[PDB]
Design a binder for this molecule. Sequence first.
Ligand SMILES: CCCCCCCCCCCC[N+](C)(C)[O-]
Ligand SMILES: CCCCCCCCCCCC[N+](C)(C)[O-]
Ligand SMILES: CCCCCCCCCCCC[N+](C)(C)[O-]
Ligand SMILES: CCCCCCCCCCCC[N+](C)(C)[O-]
Ligand SMILES: CCCCCCCCCCCC[N+](C)(C)[O-]
Ligand SMILES: CCCCCCCCCCCC[N+](C)(C)[O-]
Ligand SMILES: CCCCCCCCCCCC[N+](C)(C)[O-]
Ligand SMILES: CCCCCCCCCCCC[N+](C)(C)[O-]
Ligand SMILES: CCCCCCCCCCCC[N+](C)(C)[O-]
Ligand SMILES: CCCCCCCCCCCC[N+](C)(C)[O-]
Ligand SMILES: CCCCCCCCCCCC[N+](C)(C)[O-]
Ligand SMILES: CCCCCCCCCCCC[N+](C)(C)[O-]
Ligand SMILES: CCCCCCCCCCCC[N+](C)(C)[O-]
Ligand SMILES: CCCCCCCCCCCC[N+](C)(C)[O-]
Ligand SMILES: CCCCCCCCCCCC[N+](C)(C)[O-]
Ligand SMILES: CCCCCCCCCCCC[N+](C)(C)[O-]
Ligand SMILES: CCCCCCCCCCCC[N+](C)(C)[O-]
Ligand SMILES: CCCCCCCCCCCC[N+](C)(C)[O-]
Ligand SMILES: CCCCCCCCCCCC[N+](C)(C)[O-]
Ligand SMILES: CCCCCCCCCCCC[N+](C)(C)[O-]
Ligand SMILES: CCCCCCCCCCCC[N+](C)(C)[O-]
Ligand SMILES: CCCCCCCCCCCC[N+](C)(C)[O-]
Ligand SMILES: CCCCCCCCCCCC[N+](C)(C)[O-]
Ligand SMILES: CCCCCCCCCCCC[N+](C)(C)[O-]
Ligand SMILES: CCCCCCCCCCCC[N+](C)(C)[O-]
Ligand SMILES: CCCCCCCCCCCC[N+](C)(C)[O-]
Ligand SMILES: CCCCCCCCCCCC[N+](C)(C)[O-]
Ligand SMILES: CCCCCCCCCCCC[N+](C)(C)[O-]
Ligand SMILES: CCCCCCCCCCCC[N+](C)(C)[O-]
Ligand SMILES: CCCCCCCCCCCC[N+](C)(C)[O-]
Ligand SMILES: CCCCCCCCCCCC[N+](C)(C)[O-]
Ligand SMILES: CCCCCCCCCCCC[N+](C)(C)[O-]
Ligand SMILES: CCCCCCCCCCCC[N+](C)(C)[O-]
Ligand SMILES: CCCCCCCCCCCC[N+](C)(C)[O-]
Ligand SMILES: CCCCCCCCCCCC[N+](C)(C)[O-]
Ligand SMILES: CCCCCCCCCCCC[N+](C)(C)[O-]
Ligand SMILES: CCCCCCCCCCCC[N+](C)(C)[O-]
Ligand SMILES: CCCCCCCCCCCC[N+](C)(C)[O-]
Ligand SMILES: [Ca+2]
Ligand SMILES: [Ca+2]
Ligand SMILES: [Ca+2]
Ligand SMILES: [Ca+2]
Ligand SMILES: [Ca+2]
Ligand SMILES: [Ca+2]
Ligand SMILES: [Ca+2]
Ligand SMILES: [Ca+2]
Ligand SMILES: [Ca+2]
Length: 277
Amino acid sequence: NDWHFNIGAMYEIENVEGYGEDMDGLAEPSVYFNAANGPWRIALAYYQEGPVDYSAGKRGTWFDRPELEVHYQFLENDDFSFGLTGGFRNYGYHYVDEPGKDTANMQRWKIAPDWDVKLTDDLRFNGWLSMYKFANDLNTTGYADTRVETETGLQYTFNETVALRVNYYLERGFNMDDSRNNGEFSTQEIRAYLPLTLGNHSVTPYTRIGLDRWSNWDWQDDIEREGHDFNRVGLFYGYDFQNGLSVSLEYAFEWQDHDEGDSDKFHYAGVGVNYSF
Ligand SMILES: CCCCCCCCCCCC[N+](C)(C)[O-]
Ligand SMILES: CCCCCCCCCCCC[N+](C)(C)[O-]
Ligand SMILES: CCCCCCCCCCCC[N+](C)(C)[O-]
Ligand SMILES: CCCCCCCCCCCC[N+](C)(C)[O-]
Ligand SMILES: CCCCCCCCCCCC[N+](C)(C)[O-]
Ligand SMILES: CCCCCCCCCCCC[N+](C)(C)[O-]
Ligand SMILES: CCCCCCCCCCCC[N+](C)(C)[O-]
Ligand SMILES: CCCCCCCCCCCC[N+](C)(C)[O-]
Ligand SMILES: CCCCCCCCCCCC[N+](C)(C)[O-]
Ligand SMILES: CCCCCCCCCCCC[N+](C)(C)[O-]
Ligand SMILES: CCCCCCCCCCCC[N+](C)(C)[O-]
Ligand SMILES: CCCCCCCCCCCC[N+](C)(C)[O-]
Ligand SMILES: CCCCCCCCCCCC[N+](C)(C)[O-]
Ligand SMILES: CCCCCCCCCCCC[N+](C)(C)[O-]
Ligand SMILES: CCCCCCCCCCCC[N+](C)(C)[O-]
Ligand SMILES: CCCCCCCCCCCC[N+](C)(C)[O-]
Ligand SMILES: CCCCCCCCCCCC[N+](C)(C)[O-]
Ligand SMILES: CCCCCCCCCCCC[N+](C)(C)[O-]
Ligand SMILES: CCCCCCCCCCCC[N+](C)(C)[O-]
Ligand SMILES: CCCCCCCCCCCC[N+](C)(C)[O-]
Ligand SMILES: CCCCCCCCCCCC[N+](C)(C)[O-]
Ligand SMILES: CCCCCCCCCCCC[N+](C)(C)[O-]
Ligand SMILES: CCCCCCCCCCCC[N+](C)(C)[O-]
Ligand SMILES: CCCCCCCCCCCC[N+](C)(C)[O-]
Ligand SMILES: CCCCCCCCCCCC[N+](C)(C)[O-]
Ligand SMILES: CCCCCCCCCCCC[N+](C)(C)[O-]
Ligand SMILES: CCCCCCCCCCCC[N+](C)(C)[O-]
Ligand SMILES: CCCCCCCCCCCC[N+](C)(C)[O-]
Ligand SMILES: CCCCCCCCCCCC[N+](C)(C)[O-]
Ligand SMILES: CCCCCCCCCCCC[N+](C)(C)[O-]
Ligand SMILES: CCCCCCCCCCCC[N+](C)(C)[O-]
Ligand SMILES: CCCCCCCCCCCC[N+](C)(C)[O-]
Ligand SMILES: CCCCCCCCCCCC[N+](C)(C)[O-]
Ligand SMILES: CCCCCCCCCCCC[N+](C)(C)[O-]
Ligand SMILES: CCCCCCCCCCCC[N+](C)(C)[O-]
Ligand SMILES: CCCCCCCCCCCC[N+](C)(C)[O-]
Ligand SMILES: CCCCCCCCCCCC[N+](C)(C)[O-]
Ligand SMILES: CCCCCCCCCCCC[N+](C)(C)[O-]
Ligand SMILES: [Ca+2]
Ligand SMILES: [Ca+2]
Ligand SMILES: [Ca+2]
Ligand SMILES: [Ca+2]
Ligand SMILES: [Ca+2]
Ligand SMILES: [Ca+2]
Ligand SMILES: [Ca+2]
Ligand SMILES: [Ca+2]
Ligand SMILES: [Ca+2]
């Protein structure tokens, strides 16, 4: 035995500047709770996402997203670790001035291997990969029935204060049922992180470098895919209290170049707390 728990909350913001589809930005509140006992770990989350008009005081089309995940660690050694996560979410949508739409419920099932393997005293290879099935209101939801996503690479530890991580990242959305159509996309990036450790402070500068990316949200009128270049930099800061409440702040800017398109400017901001017990 022994049980250990974490509870926490996050508020985050995502916003393409201009009063576009995300009006004044996407605001996203969430709470989560998790519980671990040796090889088992179980996690609950609730989270909402939708655009906001702050002066009008209004939400646009938004969803909430309750979630359950259980993870089993098959093996954990300094030399090797392999674990597997099952999960499930419901995305409950509430439409606002979308003609012929009110409500929808779409589920998402995921299986995800995860691994860590020691290369030398200082260098490790780690990653996970997830496979997702979306299930119910796909035509009104406009999601694609299937997607894969992975982040995998190398981590070098220089000392107790500095480490570096480079990852390859991929996200692909695609439909295995050819009667669809909706929301296919593909993103590939390299992400690099430079975590820095001093006492109770973690500050980590990071960046994502675009490799290749396309979307086709307008497929019904324009069936060819739109290409993009995105590059992001950000900074994460956290502080441990040491008891074990901890808090964190994060900010990132992203340049969004389109092939057809004037470019966009995107900001992400977030704060969170949690408490381990
Ligand atoms: C569905 C909720 C499950 C109840 C979880 C609450 C248990 C709190 C116990 C705190 C004890 C701290 N402990 C055992 C980790 O040392
Ligand atoms: C209002 C929803 C937020 C609830 C999520 C929990 C936030 C962190 C909990 C605060 C720490 C608890 N405490 C006093 C034992 O440290
Ligand atoms: C540093 C503590 C920050 C606390 C921020 C306040 C949390 C928001 C409370 C949610 C309730 C919103 N409301 C009024 C619609 O019910
Ligand atoms: C102490 C933390 C407070 C700093 C808050 C920084 C504000 C970021 C503004 C992002 C703009 C998007 N917004 C708010 C209009 O949705
Ligand atoms: C300081 C950490 C985060 C503060 C704000 C956290 C808001 C969490 C609220 C839980 C989300 C559920 N709900 C109903 C608001 O969507
Ligand atoms: C993280 C475990 C689940 C706790 C969240 C409560 C279930 C969803 C109910 C909707 C309102 C969420 N709430 C109370 C935080 O605002
Ligand atoms: C000592 C209690 C600490 C509070 C956190 C543990 C409860 C989280 C799990 C309850 C799930 C929330 N619910 C009931 C709305 O589904
Ligand atoms: C659905 C969320 C899963 C969390 C449930 C795990 C709670 C187990 C509580 C047993 C704790 C017994 N104790 C205090 C002696 O450790
Ligand atoms: C989906 C696979 C079935 C597993 C469902 C999740 C339940 C986890 C069991 C927790 C076991 C913890 N323990 C040994 C203290 O009982
Ligand atoms: C994971 C927590 C257990 C299930 C909580 C049920 C909340 C799911 C969302 C339904 C909408 C909630 N509501 C009416 C406050 O918006
Ligand atoms: C049994 C615990 C599982 C927690 C996560 C499951 C949330 C499902 C709630 C969705 C309810 C939507 N509904 C039925 C109102 O349309
Ligand atoms: C998707 C969540 C992971 C569920 C994995 C199922 C648990 C397998 C545990 C079997 C342990 C067998 N063993 C090693 C004791 O012989
Ligand atoms: C909670 C465990 C459930 C795991 C389900 C994982 C689904 C991965 C999606 C790809 C499957 C596509 N499909 C339906 C044609 O087979
Ligand atoms: C390797 C562990 C995988 C977990 C087994 C998959 C069971 C869940 C299958 C998803 C659909 C479940 N259903 C039809 C009852 O809703
Ligand atoms: C890894 C945990 C497995 C999640 C258990 C499933 C909970 C809710 C299932 C609701 C089924 C939804 N629907 C429409 C397919 O019936
Ligand atoms: C799995 C997709 C979510 C990305 C963040 C997860 C970090 C790597 C996976 C760790 C496995 C989960 N667990 C319980 C060991 O923390
Ligand atoms: C794709 C190749 C991955 C790199 C693997 C090569 C790592 C070299 C390990 C050197 C180990 C030295 N030794 C035996 C003393 O430990
Ligand atoms: C993918 C092509 C080469 C990259 C493989 C990973 C790095 C190999 C370095 C392992 C360490 C070798 N040595 C002799 C310094 O220990
Ligand atoms: C997919 C890997 C790309 C090939 C390029 C990697 C070459 C350098 C690998 C890092 C090893 C340097 N070293 C041994 C000190 O850490
Ligand atoms: C982190 C995932 C980001 C990439 C794609 C998100 C899935 C969107 C699929 C189409 C959904 C359209 N809409 C506006 C209803 O969300
Ligand atoms: C250890 C660092 C891992 C980085 C390895 C570099 C990934 C190469 C990506 C291949 C390019 C994909 N494609 C087909 C769009 O060009
Ligand atoms: C050490 C990390 C190296 C990254 C290699 C992992 C798989 C990358 C190749 C995926 C190519 C994607 N695709 C098919 C769209 O080109
Ligand atoms: C995550 C990618 C791996 C980057 C590899 C970093 C190479 C470190 C070489 C440092 C040389 C060691 N030193 C100072 C003793 O000379
Ligand atoms: C390397 C240790 C620190 C890693 C954390 C840095 C990035 C955290 C990303 C937070 C969430 C941003 N996102 C993907 C939701 O938009
Ligand atoms: C948002 C960035 C915040 C910057 C705070 C970083 C300051 C680290 C101070 C290191 C000194 C810690 N100390 C005294 C325990 O050694
Ligand atoms: C290893 C992660 C370090 C975080 C990223 C640091 C920024 C490096 C990229 C150059 C930034 C150029 N500029 C002005 C367009 O931002
Ligand atoms: C901070 C690591 C070095 C990053 C260098 C690549 C940054 C990509 C920014 C736009 C791409 C322009 N290009 C091809 C000249 O790099
Ligand atoms: C530290 C290891 C160095 C790996 C750095 C990864 C950059 C290679 C670029 C991958 C493919 C580039 N391209 C053009 C296919 O997108
Ligand atoms: C921290 C080491 C990472 C090295 C970064 C490698 C940059 C790969 C070049 C990407 C350029 C892709 N493209 C086609 C948009 O120019
Ligand atoms: C560890 C690196 C693995 C090698 C991945 C790089 C494969 C290059 C793929 C070239 C694809 C050309 N294209 C885009 C026309 O298909
Ligand atoms: C909204 C940001 C919350 C950050 C609060 C945490 C600040 C770190 C406290 C600094 C040091 C206190 N100390 C160690 C001198 O006692
Ligand atoms: C400049 C940010 C203000 C910091 C907020 C006040 C909380 C004080 C931090 C408690 C420090 C206790 N500590 C970690 C020395 O043991
Ligand atoms: C960073 C946000 C400010 C939250 C306040 C931080 C609490 C610091 C210490 C918690 C209580 C510690 N205690 C009672 C032993 O001193
Ligand atoms: C913990 C991170 C908090 C620091 C906030 C980041 C400082 C940079 C200010 C945002 C710059 C916006 N931009 C790129 C449009 O100039
Ligand atoms: C508590 C740490 C201090 C918070 C710092 C807040 C400054 C971030 C503002 C970034 C927004 C700049 N802008 C409007 C060009 O995007
Ligand atoms: C740089 C860290 C950012 C932490 C705060 C994230 C939440 C910001 C709250 C959104 C601001 C809304 N507002 C005031 C523009 O209307
Ligand atoms: C530095 C502490 C910041 C705590 C973050 C919680 C503040 C955001 C919650 C209030 C909502 C503000 N908003 C986005 C409606 O303008
Ligand atoms: C925001 C809710 C935070 C509550 C977290 C912890 C409550 C559990 C009590 C700790 C241990 C005391 N006792 C004997 C039950 O173990
Ligand atoms: Ca998001
Ligand atoms: Ca805009
Ligand atoms: Ca906007
Ligand atoms: Ca306004
Ligand atoms: Ca610490
Ligand atoms: Ca198109
Ligand atoms: Ca087009
Ligand atoms: Ca492209
Ligand atoms: Ca352009």
